[PDB]
Amino acid sequence: MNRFWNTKKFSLTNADGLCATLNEISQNDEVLVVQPSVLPVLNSLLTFQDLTQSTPVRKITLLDDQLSDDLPSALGSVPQMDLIFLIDVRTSLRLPPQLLDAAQKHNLSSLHIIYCRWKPSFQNTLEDTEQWQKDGFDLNSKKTHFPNVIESQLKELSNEYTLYPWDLLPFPQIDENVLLTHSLYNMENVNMYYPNLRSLQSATESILVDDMVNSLQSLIFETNSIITNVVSIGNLSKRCSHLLKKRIDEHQTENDLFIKGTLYGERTNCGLEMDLIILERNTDPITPLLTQLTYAGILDDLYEFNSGIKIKEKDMNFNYKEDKIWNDLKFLNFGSIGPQLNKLAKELQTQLQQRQAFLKNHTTLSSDVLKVVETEEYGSFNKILELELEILMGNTLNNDIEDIILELQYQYEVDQKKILRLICLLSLCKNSLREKDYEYLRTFMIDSWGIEKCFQLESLAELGFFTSKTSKSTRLQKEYRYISQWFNTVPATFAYSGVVPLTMRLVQMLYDRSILFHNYSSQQPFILSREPRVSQTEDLIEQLYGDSHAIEESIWVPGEDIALVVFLGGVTMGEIAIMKHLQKILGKKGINKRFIIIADGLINGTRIMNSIS
Amino acid sequence: INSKNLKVEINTEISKFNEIYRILEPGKSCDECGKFLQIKKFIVFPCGHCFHWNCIIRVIL
């Protein structure tokens, strides 16, 4: 807020707007009807008690076909004032049929709905006071617009179209530092980047990039920032950067270009820098599939977080704004939790009961997790780690891989997803697999897991995960054993099998070429540069991607620090753990910066496997 | 006598006016150019006016 990104301050605006709208609906007893996908987000913002006390609504429901049978049971009952639906139409451009069938059948006499949208900063605070009646109606907005958007398909029943545009802007839930935008799923639980229908990839990609650009524009115009340097990586990031630049340069108002002349300008500057490094998940498919070792990573891949940051099996919330025990243990390694918990418990003995309840709950949950790690296919949780560590450095032999893949297939029972992920990593690590092993691996797969597995192994065999030795979308076509020489991923590191992520070193090289100095270096343009630059580092990335055009460096202004590292394609939460380590080590070395990680939705190995199915 | 008194008063006023400017700059300031006073120079006049030493020379030209 006001050039200082007070992230928690973003939370209040959405709640205030929703409360004002709901209280301005009607001063009676209201019943709320909320879409299943958006409800968890709303509950993570407004508590039930606050919702009841602030506005006279007293009931919340869900959009389901069960309501059709309950139309004469639930909808017929209550209905003290009216029914206020809440829908999300930001993606999939289609209203759910539930409201369509309920409107005509139950014959509601008052239809009011709520639709979500990003904040229209271009409205610039209603533009003063309409310029004293538009200086004699010199400007007007009647019919100066298309008749309807998306909701033009709603042209049935009555004219009760009291729409209400509730505003929404990103706010942090999992942690103070990192915000999160939900644009990676539809209402049908289909991945927005890896859809299970290989006929409409291009449109889905365009829609995703458009929505991401819209969210970034909303945040940028809300915070009143001036981007100075852009480091785009990949193909889609190029289009995203160009579209964002065009949209910023088109829709910006006046009274700020004048400031753009005063600040920065010609022959002078004021020492303000913001960076917009952008990456794509397809660039490095090496590390969304490794096993998590941090506490929240282990707790995540065994029990999937929903849209809200909570879990079904437990009841206590993991929100950071009311508890401090979770703050200091979320990103620590699993091994260093026990003794720390023992010390925390023993120090309080000499020494309010809410802390006791919190520590008891944490101890019980940790004990349950430790118990469930073992005795549940004992040794698998470690065996996969040793196998992954062996594969990453490279120890594959002639036809011996077929012996170990089925070694744990039925000796220890294991899910399909683990095997599929491991074989994908095997096929991806060597950057190529010969033509004499697919004929056996695919045969065994189709033998053991049905007939539909052939379709999965065919569809997944074109995104780059499952390739054969015999508009490129920026795949990776270089052996990984080479990358272990330029970079020092395998020696400082946690949340993995002792391996540094590839994105980690990719962002490291932009500011300090130390590891690149040890290997493949005789001269460098610099050793410590404050501004992001890319020079004399083309050939290494020319062979790494097959084209010396993936790297893009853009300077916008002609002539401590906020860096916006967005993530198009999900964030593997282990990267968040190493981001803090990067910030700490860079601050120690001398360069002081602050990182904000924009995420389109948490991504994880198993969560990917159901996507392409 | 009146001329002598007037000359004495004028000399006293001139002597008093020396090193008694005590003009003040407001929190943030600018004029004529519009951009910012504190970027080029501080050509300041009485009755609250500000110039860049460049806008003024542009005006006279």
Side-chain angles (χ1 to χ4, degrees), chain A residues 1-67 72 74 76 79 83-613, chain B residues 20-61:
Chain A
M1 186 66 204
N2 276 311
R3 302 273 328 169
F4 298 142
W5 289 39
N6 211 351
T7 62
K8 59 196 178 302
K9 198 163 167 310
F10 293 128
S11 172
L12 275 297
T13 291
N14 298 317
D16 287 327
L18 188 153
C19 179
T21 286
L22 266 69
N23 218 3
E24 265 193 7
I25 293 295
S26 46
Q27 274 307 298
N28 281 313
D29 181 19
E30 296 175 352
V31 161
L32 197 51
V33 178
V34 193
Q35 213 175 12
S37 169
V38 68
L39 187 139
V41 190
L42 191 146
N43 209 1
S44 294
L45 186 50
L46 279 80
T47 62
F48 198 93
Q49 296 298 109
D50 293 332
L51 195 40
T52 51
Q53 67 88 21
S54 158
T55 181
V57 67
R58 309 287 149 82
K59 185 51 71 183
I60 60 170
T61 47
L62 205 69
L63 277 296
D64 278 324
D65 47 359
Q66 187 57 253
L67 189 56
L83 276 297
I84 316 295
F85 310 144
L86 200 151
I87 56 188
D88 194 7
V89 74
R90 279 175 304 178
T91 61
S92 164
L93 317 166
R94 185 86 149 154
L95 269 74
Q98 272 57 32
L99 60 94
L100 273 175
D101 62 64
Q104 52 90 30
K105 168 187 87 164
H106 182 74
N107 292 109
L108 294 166
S109 303
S110 63
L111 267 193
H112 324 306
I113 49 177
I114 316 296
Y115 68 102
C116 300
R117 66 177 203 181
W118 310 103
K119 205 164 175 304
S121 81
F122 316 130
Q123 296 313 105
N124 62 10
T125 316
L126 308 183
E127 202 262 327
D128 195 359
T129 55
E130 268 82 9
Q131 291 305 98
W132 56 91
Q133 304 173 355
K134 279 85 72 175
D135 213 345
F137 63 92
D138 204 5
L139 190 148
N140 210 333
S141 173
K142 47 167 199 72
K143 195 52 71 177
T144 78
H145 66 86
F146 205 79
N148 197 323
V149 295
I150 306 165
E151 274 79 4
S152 68
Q153 67 184 359
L154 201 55
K155 202 54 68 179
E156 315 307 316
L157 206 74
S158 305
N159 46 0
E160 312 150 2
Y161 282 62
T162 315
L163 267 72
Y164 281 130
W166 171 39
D167 272 24
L168 190 43
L169 60 84
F171 57 98
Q173 315 177 0
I174 174 62
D175 189 14
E176 208 286 326
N177 215 334
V178 287
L179 283 72
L180 194 148
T181 73
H182 311 77
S183 293
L184 190 151
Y185 294 93
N186 278 309
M187 281 155 308
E188 300 289 331
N189 272 314
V190 62
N191 192 301
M192 187 66 203
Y193 203 49
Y194 296 101
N196 51 352
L197 192 148
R198 197 62 43 176
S199 174
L200 56 85
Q201 183 68 41
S202 310
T204 300
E205 266 181 13
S206 278
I207 293 193
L208 158 70
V209 76
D210 177 75
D211 196 69
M212 171 75 38
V213 163
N214 272 318
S215 177
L216 263 71
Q217 189 176 42
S218 168
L219 280 175
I220 283 175
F221 270 112
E222 209 280 336
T223 56
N224 315 297
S225 291
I226 309 104
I227 296 189
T228 178
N229 321 309
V230 176
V231 184
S232 167
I233 299 184
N235 164 49
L236 209 63
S237 76
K238 227 180 180 180
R239 161 198 309 182
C240 171
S241 314
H242 274 238
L243 193 67
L244 184 46
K245 169 177 286 297
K246 181 152 290 163
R247 286 222 198 175
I248 291 297
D249 268 327
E250 194 148 17
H251 272 207
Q252 82 280 56
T253 182
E254 293 293 328
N255 201 12
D256 70 340
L257 178 56
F258 193 57
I259 315 301
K260 191 183 165 292
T262 65
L263 194 83
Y264 289 126
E266 168 59 45
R267 214 194 147 188
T268 185
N269 47 358
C270 318
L272 309 171
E273 191 149 321
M274 283 73 74
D275 299 332
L276 199 82
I277 298 94
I278 296 182
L279 283 84
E280 315 159 354
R281 186 49 79 179
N282 281 322
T283 60
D284 57 356
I286 295 170
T287 176
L289 318 181
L290 317 175
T291 306
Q292 318 304 108
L293 276 76
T294 184
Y295 190 40
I298 294 171
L299 190 149
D300 181 56
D301 75 323
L302 260 60
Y303 310 95
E304 312 287 336
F305 283 131
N306 52 314
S307 195
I309 188 65
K310 61 188 56 50
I311 197 64
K312 37 177 180 289
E313 62 174 1
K314 304 314 189 322
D315 49 352
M316 73 291 291
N317 48 1
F318 307 97
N319 190 291
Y320 79 101
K321 309 173 310 170
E322 79 279 8
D323 213 338
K324 64 90 176 179
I325 296 307
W326 177 240
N327 261 324
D328 310 348
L329 313 178
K330 43 176 169 194
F331 277 75
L332 299 196
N333 209 34
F334 198 87
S336 43
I337 288 174
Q340 160 71 254
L341 194 52
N342 304 141
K343 182 257 290 194
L344 191 149
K346 72 168 298 304
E347 70 91 14
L348 188 149
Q349 169 260 329
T350 79
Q351 301 167 355
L352 189 151
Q353 294 317 110
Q354 198 185 3
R355 301 275 324 287
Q356 166 58 235
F358 284 155
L359 59 91
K360 178 251 296 179
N361 293 16
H362 283 79
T363 301
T364 49
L365 196 143
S366 177
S367 57
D368 291 331
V369 164
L370 174 56
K371 159 174 301 312
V372 77
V373 170
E374 273 64 37
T375 300
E376 181 209 19
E377 300 96 10
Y378 64 92
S380 160
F381 207 91
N382 316 93
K383 177 63 177 65
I384 61 169
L385 273 177
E386 285 103 13
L387 194 151
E388 163 186 307
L389 193 44
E390 187 89 26
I391 293 310
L392 291 174
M393 61 79 71
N395 269 316
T396 68
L397 320 172
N398 189 0
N399 201 31
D400 78 320
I401 178 60
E402 84 178 339
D403 165 67
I404 195 64
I405 181 64
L406 59 92
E407 197 271 325
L408 61 87
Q409 201 278 333
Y410 53 91
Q411 159 66 81
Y412 322 122
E413 297 310 316
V414 70
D415 199 0
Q416 309 167 356
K417 278 84 177 185
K418 321 291 298 314
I419 308 286
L420 207 69
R421 204 169 75 182
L422 196 146
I423 190 175
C424 279
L425 179 135
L426 270 161
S427 162
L428 190 46
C429 167
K430 291 187 305 202
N431 200 75
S432 50
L433 197 148
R434 77 219 204 194
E435 301 305 330
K436 267 74 164 169
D437 297 337
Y438 279 0
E439 311 153 349
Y440 166 73
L441 268 175
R442 177 168 39 166
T443 310
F444 158 80
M445 202 36 49
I446 200 73
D447 189 358
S448 175
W449 308 100
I451 181 61
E452 74 274 58
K453 203 52 75 183
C454 182
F455 283 113
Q456 324 311 312
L457 288 192
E458 202 276 304
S459 76
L460 190 150
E462 52 166 301
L463 293 173
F465 288 87
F466 183 76
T467 62
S468 86
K469 196 176 270 290
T470 307
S471 72
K472 313 303 148 279
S473 171
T474 55
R475 303 277 163 284
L476 190 145
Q477 305 90 334
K478 192 39 151 43
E479 294 273 359
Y480 193 57
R481 61 94 169 176
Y482 280 104
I483 315 168
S484 172
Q485 178 196 329
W486 285 273
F487 291 116
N488 220 321
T489 81
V490 182
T493 182
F494 41 78
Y496 291 107
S497 170
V499 293
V500 164
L502 190 145
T503 189
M504 196 41 248
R505 291 330 201 184
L506 280 197
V507 190
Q508 178 66 41
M509 171 282 318
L510 295 176
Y511 283 155
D512 184 74
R513 311 183 197 286
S514 59
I515 59 170
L516 176 55
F517 171 71
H518 271 172
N519 292 318
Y520 177 68
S521 87
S522 72
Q523 81 299 329
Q524 296 279 46
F526 65 94
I527 297 172
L528 193 141
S529 163
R530 178 150 179 253
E531 301 141 9
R533 290 200 305 284
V534 167
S535 65
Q536 272 316 113
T537 318
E538 298 296 327
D539 289 330
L540 172 61
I541 203 161
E542 185 262 6
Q543 267 159 335
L544 202 65
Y545 290 120
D547 178 15
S548 170
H549 298 80
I551 281 293
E552 156 65 35
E553 182 173 0
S554 296
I555 294 292
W556 294 14
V557 58
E560 52 203 15
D561 203 341
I562 310 295
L564 301 188
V565 293
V566 304
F567 264 110
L568 279 150
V571 290
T572 78
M573 61 79 70
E575 288 162 346
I576 301 176
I578 206 67
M579 201 75 48
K580 299 321 188 54
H581 178 98
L582 180 62
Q583 207 260 325
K584 160 198 307 198
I585 186 183
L586 284 180
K588 170 149 175 315
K589 199 187 269 171
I591 309 163
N592 311 317
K593 285 167 162 287
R594 167 169 200 235
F595 273 49
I596 298 160
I597 297 100
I598 282 186
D600 43 7
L602 309 168
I603 198 156
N604 181 15
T606 67
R607 198 169 290 116
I608 292 192
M609 302 325 317
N610 308 347
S611 161
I612 179 67
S613 159
Chain B
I20 202 65
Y21 284 177
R22 195 189 175 94
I23 196 177
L24 176 69
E25 279 191 354
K28 163 284 326 307
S29 53
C30 192
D31 200 340
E32 173 56 37
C33 183
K35 298 177 169 47
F36 199 47
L37 178 59
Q38 309 184 0
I39 195 166
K40 192 77 193 194
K41 213 191 258 205
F42 277 168
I43 295 276
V44 64
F45 304 141
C47 68
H49 282 53
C50 310
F51 285 91
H52 271 165
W53 163 272
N54 218 13
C55 183
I56 181 166
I57 201 163
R58 176 151 35 243
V59 165
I60 61 170
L61 214 48

